[PDB]
Amino acid sequence: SMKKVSVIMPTFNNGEKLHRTISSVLNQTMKSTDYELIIIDDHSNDNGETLNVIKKYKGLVRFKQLKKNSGNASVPRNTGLKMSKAEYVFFLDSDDLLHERALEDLYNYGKENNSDLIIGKYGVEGVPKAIFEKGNVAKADIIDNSIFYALSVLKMFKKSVIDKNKIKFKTFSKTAEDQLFTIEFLMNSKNYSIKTDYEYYIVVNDSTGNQYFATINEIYKAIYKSPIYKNQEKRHQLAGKYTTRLLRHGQKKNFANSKMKYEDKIEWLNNFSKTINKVPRDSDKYVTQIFNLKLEAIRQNDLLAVMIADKLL
Amino acid sequence: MKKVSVIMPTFNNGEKLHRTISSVLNQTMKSTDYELIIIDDHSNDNGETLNVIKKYKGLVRFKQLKKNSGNASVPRNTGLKMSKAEYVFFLDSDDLLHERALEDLYNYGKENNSDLIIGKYGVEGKVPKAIFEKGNVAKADIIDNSIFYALSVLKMFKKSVIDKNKIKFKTFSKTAEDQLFTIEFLMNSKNYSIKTDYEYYIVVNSTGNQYFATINEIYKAIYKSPIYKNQEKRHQLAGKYTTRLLRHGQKKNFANSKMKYEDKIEWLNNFSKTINKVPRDSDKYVTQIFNLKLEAIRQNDLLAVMIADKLL
Amino acid sequence: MKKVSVIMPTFNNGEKLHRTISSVLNQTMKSTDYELIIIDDHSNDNGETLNVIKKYKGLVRFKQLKKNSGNASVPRNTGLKMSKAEYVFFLDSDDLLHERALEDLYNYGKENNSDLIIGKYGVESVPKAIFEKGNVAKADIIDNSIFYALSVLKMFKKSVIDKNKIKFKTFSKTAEDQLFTIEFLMNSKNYSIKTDYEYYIVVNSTGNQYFATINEIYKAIYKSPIYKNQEKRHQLAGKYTTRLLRHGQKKNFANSKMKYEDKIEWLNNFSKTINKVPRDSDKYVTQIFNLKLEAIRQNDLLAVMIADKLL
Ligand SMILES: CC(=O)N[C@H]1[C@@H](OP(=O)(O)OP(=O)(O)OC[C@H]2O[C@@H](n3ccc(=O)[nH]c3=O)[C@H](O)[C@@H]2O)O[C@H](CO)[C@@H](O)[C@@H]1O
Ligand SMILES: CC(=O)N[C@H]1[C@@H](OP(=O)(O)OP(=O)(O)OC[C@H]2O[C@@H](n3ccc(=O)[nH]c3=O)[C@H](O)[C@@H]2O)O[C@H](CO)[C@@H](O)[C@@H]1O
Ligand SMILES: CC(=O)N[C@H]1[C@@H](OP(=O)(O)OP(=O)(O)OC[C@H]2O[C@@H](n3ccc(=O)[nH]c3=O)[C@H](O)[C@@H]2O)O[C@H](CO)[C@@H](O)[C@@H]1O
Ligand SMILES: [Cl-]
Ligand SMILES: [Cl-]
Ligand SMILES: [Cl-]
Ligand SMILES: [Cl-]
Ligand SMILES: [Cl-]
Ligand SMILES: [Cl-]
Ligand SMILES: [Cl-]
Ligand SMILES: [Cl-]
Ligand SMILES: [Cl-]
Ligand SMILES: [Cl-]
Ligand SMILES: [Cl-]
Ligand SMILES: [Cl-]
Ligand SMILES: [Cl-]
Ligand SMILES: [Cl-]
Ligand SMILES: [Cl-]
Ligand SMILES: [Cl-]
Ligand SMILES: [Cl-]
Ligand SMILES: [Cl-]
Ligand SMILES: [Cl-]
Ligand SMILES: [Cl-]
Ligand SMILES: [Mg+2]
Ligand SMILES: [Mg+2]
Ligand SMILES: [Mg+2]
Ligand SMILES: [Mg+2]
Ligand SMILES: [Mg+2]
């Protein structure tokens, strides 16, 4: 009997707080025997506090401790993926909470719709919006349902897609690697669903650009190599819409007139410029028109022009 | 030698062409003093246009080209060679002449020894303005009477000027060929007249290689003028044309348009190359709001042109 | 030792010079406690200016240069060599002192051990920000807007000038006076501002020499023995850059009727000079100028033109 869902949760120095997160997972409307919680501790060093909490649920979770701290969720999440033989996986960050109906509602909706990906609406304690404005969507589309604006991995993923395509979290970047996983997944599957009956996942709140733009480069390459979105114009459309999201919400989007040092601005822009210049210009017509000059200035690797563009926005 | 030769190119006009023809044949000028030369550009509308012309047999002259030239140039050059008249008046095949058009322009022209006479334009449907705002001008000035803003050939031109200086319409440009004709004429003649008593002419409604080749010829016409020989005067005329080009040129706002990037580069490259053959001495005569755009173009900097356009 | 030497260069002033000399000789300060040193820069006005000066023999000190130098620098340097007074005051041959100028400025300077005393200016537009907080015993270059009041028409402690060998440069015919005041400011600590009266009444290029002088200002700042902290030098330099963009020669050259070729040479000189200034100073420049400053660093005329359209 293959499990319906593996919840994959990295921990690091969470301490007593973790009780509430683990409890939200163990308290599900889904039958306890139909799912599992996989905890991967990224070598906590908080005088055993995190491990003491995990040990209180010994027998109710699967657990692996890493021997050295990796520094972020990527290696721990990859470890979880190797351990899961479930139908779907769900990534849960150690500080957050699941609604008690999250696994049952998202899995059932997935099964009903043969979904590769099921996105439950996010709540916040103390998050994306447009994707959830249309109610439940059985067969969502990346552009029409604003999925480029909600690329966290805090979602339910069909494990066969991940295994067949060898999708792993990259360990070369401490930013945007989550975006990349979700994009690789989307580019290798067709059926996406959006479930909004409850706030199913609660988010609890508390550089050169080399690695960042390397990650961005991998996003565009995933679009342009997609076995699902094979048509070259659809690839241009997807790429141009991603470019738009990047210019709206990207890191240091307004770096050019910022207090960043000149030599850092030049390195940042060199990275951005060489990244976007590997993207066909055929994608540019799908970028929102207000960004025409800023995008061209970035292609031209011209800091003065980006400065000017930003002043005219 | 007839007074006026109305040279009218035709192409797939149909039954609506009747209006135009009768506007020429119903002039107040003595019937035997003018001639309508119709030059069909090898119409291909299943005889429709041909059948309209045929009904004026005996009243018009008609030559037909073996093959479609693609625009009014070659036909007009055919009309020029045929006409042996004092003045020529170019008439497009959908437009109309006021009944007192040929008489009033010719008399005014003969009165003032004019090489060129410009009648005020009217409109049907949903034309230059400034040139006609002072009423009739006997001896006009290109700059003062805004002649660079009314460069269509829909005017009365003295034939001897054309013949002596071998002014021909260029075939190698689908755009701005009319401007070049008028400009070559202006740079090889001295007396220009404006007549405004009535709306005399009624207007009825590329990588840039060829286009900027034509623009280039305009500047060359100015700087080699045997009429305007002073080097500073040539600079003034050139600079004043630059302003007109920036105000009303083809694809003036190409920089922020939906044109492909590669096409924008080629277009700007041609524009840049052309303007950089124009002395910077002309730049001071350009309207000051265009200072940045003009320099952006001399520098062949598409970003700077994009920015310039955003600030205008 | 005299309390004050007034140093006044003259050139072809003629009879008008009487007023200015009278304004100096009619001070409330005791006549024995101060001198007027007049250095004529070889006037050529058919003896007229020198004839005026001769009428005060025994009441002033006087030297005439062998040849005209072309501006106040050489004459003023000559005056410095002649004064062995406690303080000097540069007065121009067309301006007027208030009768209580030397006394009030000297007294105020003595009481606050001032290296520099600045009296409020009148006019027959002169700096105003420096004077808007009333009297200031110990002024700050930045808080009291001194970079916006760099004329030498002020009272300077002579020991500072002597010890540091501060001389007027004869490089260019613009900004030499700024450089003098800056060199002095960077080698002294105590400055005073006195505003009781209008003490001093002001009576109304390739860029090669000019930008050479600006370069000298930045150098003065960066080798200052007083402001010795490196971040403090970056701050002062940034504040000067701001003053330069606000009030500099041909500050709006880019969109001007200047010939294109002259614009390029001008900007080339401005660019070369500013690029000798550490970028670490740039963050202290008023942010509205961020683009204009970068465009000058980049030696990009189109970018400067654009920056000026947006200002
Ligand atoms: C608003 C926002 O941008 N949220 C993102 C942010 O969360 P956020 O900034 O909240 O990151 P967290 O502190 O929740 O850490 C993310 C996860 O990584 C684990 N961890 C942390 C450090 C470590 O050395 N090893 C380790 O495994 C934590 O235990 C946790 O499970 O980054 C996460 C990881 O990319 C994303 O899932 C979130 O969507
Ligand atoms: C508003 C405006 O800018 N109008 C111009 C435009 O006219 P417009 O755009 O109205 O063009 P028209 O339809 O009037 O055609 C112009 C003339 O060219 C002839 N023709 C057309 C097609 C063809 O293959 N061969 C041919 O000879 C037509 O019969 C007509 O006599 O172009 C004309 C020719 O440059 C100019 O005189 C007009 O000033
Ligand atoms: C508003 C303004 O910024 N005014 C400045 C301008 O004064 P301004 O424009 O008033 O220049 P002035 O004519 O006063 O000349 C300054 C002094 O230099 C002398 N002189 C002049 C020519 C000459 O060949 N030799 C010579 O010694 C004059 O006699 C006078 O004493 O330049 C002066 C000297 O840089 C500065 O002190 C003033 O602050
Ligand atoms: Cl518990
Ligand atoms: Cl158990
Ligand atoms: Cl790994
Ligand atoms: Cl639906
Ligand atoms: Cl889509
Ligand atoms: Cl989108
Ligand atoms: Cl986003
Ligand atoms: Cl998200
Ligand atoms: Cl990935
Ligand atoms: Cl892919
Ligand atoms: Cl991002
Ligand atoms: Cl800004
Ligand atoms: Cl912009
Ligand atoms: Cl025109
Ligand atoms: Cl063309
Ligand atoms: Cl045009
Ligand atoms: Cl393109
Ligand atoms: Cl300041
Ligand atoms: Cl310091
Ligand atoms: Cl200055
Ligand atoms: Mg249960
Ligand atoms: Mg978190
Ligand atoms: Mg027409
Ligand atoms: Mg630029
Ligand atoms: Mg003066």
| Residue B271 backbone dihedrals phi, psi, to 5 degrees | -60, -50
Q: What's the rounded Cα separation, in Å, for the pair A15 and A53? A: 7
Q: What's the rounded Cα separation, in Å, for the pair A221 and A226? A: 8
CB C217 within 8 A of CB C249: no
Cα three-residue angle C274-C276-C281, rounded to 5 degrees:
70
Residue type for B32, please? T
Cα three-residue angle A63-A65-A67, rounded to 5 degrees:
165
The tokens describing C79, both together, are 């005056």
Q: What's the rounded Cα separation, in Å, for the pair A280 and B270? A: 25
CA neighbor of B291 nearest in space, from C306, C252, C267: C306
Query: Which chain B residue's Cα is nearest to C309?
Result: B311
CB B131 within 8 A of CB B155: no
* Torsion over CA: B89, B95, B99, B104 (sign): negative
**A116 assigned to a ligand binding site:** no
Hey, what's the torsion of the CAs at B213, B215, B221, B223, to 10 degrees?
-100
Helix or strand (DSSP H, E) at A304: helix A303-312
The tokens describing B236, both together, are 């003034």
Q: What's the rounded Cα separation, in Å, for the pair B39 and B79? A: 7
Radius of gyration, alpha carbons of chain A: 20
Catalytic residue among C177, C262, C300, C308: C177
C25: exposed, middle or buried (Cβ count in 10 Å: 0-12, 13-18, 19+): middle
The tokens describing A4, both together, are 């319906």
Contact status of C260 with chain B (Cβ, < 8 Å): yes
Q: What's the rounded Cα separation, in Å, for the pair C218 and C226? A: 15
Ligand at minimal distance from the CA of A12 is 1
CB B136 within 8 A of CB B158: no
Bridge partners of residue A38, in order along the sequence: A8, A62
Pick from B280, B283, B304: CB nearest C302: B304
Q: Where does residue A250 fall: left (phi above 0), alpha (psi -120 to 50 degrees), or beta otherwise?
A: beta
CB B254 within 8 A of CB B267: yes
CA neighbor of A24 nearest in space, from A201, A268, A234: A201
**A302 assigned to a ligand binding site:** no
Which residues lie below 8 Å from residue A231, measured CB to CB, with a gap of 6+?
none
Contact status of C305 with chain B (Cβ, < 8 Å): yes
Q: Resolution to 1 decimal, in Å?
A: 2.0
Q: Given an 8 Å threshold on Cβ–Cβ distance, is A296 in contact with B310?
A: no
Question: Min CA distance, A304 vs chain C (Å)?
Answer: 7
Query: From the CA of A145, how far away is ligand 8's center (Å)?
Result: 8
| Residue C242 backbone dihedrals phi, psi, to 5 degrees | -60, -50
Q: Which of B62, B63, B71, B151 to mutate to test the pocket of ligand 2 (most atoms within 8 A of CB)?
A: B71
Query: From the CA of A102, how far away is ligand 7's center (Å)?
Result: 19
CB B10 within 8 A of CB B62: no
Q: State how beta strands B116-119 and B192-195 pair.
A: parallel
Q: What's the rounded Cα separation, in Å, for the pair A112 and B105? A: 84
Which residues lie below 8 Å from residue B58, measured CB to CB, with a gap of 6+?
none
Q: Which of B11, B20, B126, B154 to mutate to test the pocket of ligand 2 (most atoms within 8 A of CB)?
A: B11
Q: Which of C53, C92, C202, C204 to mutate to test the pocket of ligand 3 (most atoms within 8 A of CB)?
A: C92
DSSP string over B39-97: EE----STTHHHHHHHTTBTTBEEEE-SS--SSSHHHHHHHHHH--SSEEEE--TT-EE
Identify the DSSP state of C120. P
Which residues lie below 8 Å from residue C74, measured CB to CB, with a gap of 6+?
C41, C65, C168, C170
Cα three-residue angle C279-C285-C286, rounded to 5 degrees:
150
Bridge partners of residue C63, in order along the sequence: C39
CA neighbor of C116 nearest in space, from C98, C141, C97: C141
Bridge partners of residue A158, in order along the sequence: A88
Q: Kindly list the strands in the beta sheet with B61-64, ordered across the sheet, starting from the edge strand earlier in the chain.
A: B61-64, B34-40, B4-10, B87-90, B156-158, B116-119, B192-195
CB B125 within 8 A of CB B205: yes
Which residues lie below 8 Å from residue C149, measured CB to CB, with a gap of 6+?
C118, C127, C129, C130
**A210 assigned to a ligand binding site:** no
CB C253 within 8 A of CB C265: no
Q: Where does residue A138 fall: left (phi above 0), alpha (psi -120 to 50 degrees), or beta otherwise?
A: alpha
Secondary structure class of A192 (helix, strand, coil)? strand
Please tell me the residue having the least CA distance from ligand 2 atom 14: B92
* Torsion over CA: B298, B301, B302, B308 (sign): negative
CA neighbor of C307 nearest in space, from C291, C296, C294: C291
Task: Please tell me the number of Cα atoms within 13 Å of A187 on its side-chain side.
Answer: 28
Please tell me the residue having the least CA distance from ligand 1 atom 11: A93
For chain C, the residue count is 311
Q: State how beta strands A35-41 and A62-65 pair.
A: parallel
| Ligand 3 binding residues, C-beta < 6 A | C 9-11, 41, 68-72, 75, 92-94, 151, 153, 177
Which residues lie below 8 Å from residue C143, measured CB to CB, with a gap of 6+?
none
Query: From the CA of C98, how far away is ligand 28's center (Å)?
Result: 16
Which ligand 3 atom minimizes the distance to the CA of C153? 37
What distance lies between CA C87 and its chain's CA centroid?
A: 16
**Furthest-apart CA atoms within chain C: distance in Å:** 61
CB A76 within 8 A of CB A19: no
**B283 assigned to a ligand binding site:** no
CB A273 within 8 A of CB A298: yes
Please tell me the residue having the least CA distance from ligand 3 atom 28: C10
Q: Where does residue C157 fall: left (phi above 0), alpha (psi -120 to 50 degrees), or beta otherwise?
A: beta
Query: From the CA of A190, how far away is ligand 8's center (Å)?
Result: 10
**A93 assigned to a ligand binding site:** yes
Secondary structure class of C140 (helix, strand, coil)? coil
Identify the DSSP state of A145. T
Secondary structure class of C22 (helix, strand, coil)? helix
Residue appearing with tokens 């003036």: B252
Hey, what's the torsion of the CAs at C131, C137, C142, C144, to 10 degrees?
-10
**What are the C-alpha distances in Å from A112 to residues A75, A89, B92, B172, C230?**
32, 17, 70, 67, 69
Query: Which chain C residue's Cα is nearest to B309?
Result: C306
CA neighbor of A23 nearest in space, from A86, A105, A87, A94: A94
Hey, what's the torsion of the CAs at B38, B44, B46, B51, to 10 degrees?
0
Question: Min CA distance, C302 vs chain B (Å)?
Answer: 7
Question: Min CA distance, C292 vs chain A (Å)?
Answer: 9
Beta strands in chain B (DSSP E): 4-10, 34-40, 61-64, 87-90, 96-97, 116-119, 121-124, 156-158, 192-195, 201-204
Measure the N-to-C terminal CA separation of chain C; round to a whole number of Å: 53
Identify the DSSP state of B153. S
Q: What's the rounded Cα separation, in Å, for the pair C208 and C219? A: 17
Please report which residue ranges of chain C form alpha helices under DSSP H: 17-25, 48-54, 73-82, 101-111, 158-163, 176-185, 208-222, 230-247, 260-274, 290-298, 301-310
Q: What's the rounded Cα separation, in Å, for the pair A165 and A158? A: 12
Catalytic residue among A96, A105, A116, A178: A178
The tokens describing C157, both together, are 């402690």
Count CB-CB contacts under 10 A for residue C129: 12
Please tell me the residue having the least CA distance from ligand 3 atom 21: C71
Ligand at minimal distance from the CA of B264 is 20
Helix or strand (DSSP H, E) at B307: helix B302-311
Which residues sit directly before a break in chain A (C to N > 2.5 Å)? 126, 206
Which residues lie below 8 Å from residue C53, measured CB to CB, with a gap of 6+?
C10, C17, C38, C40, C60, C62
Ligand at minimal distance from the CA of B207 is 18
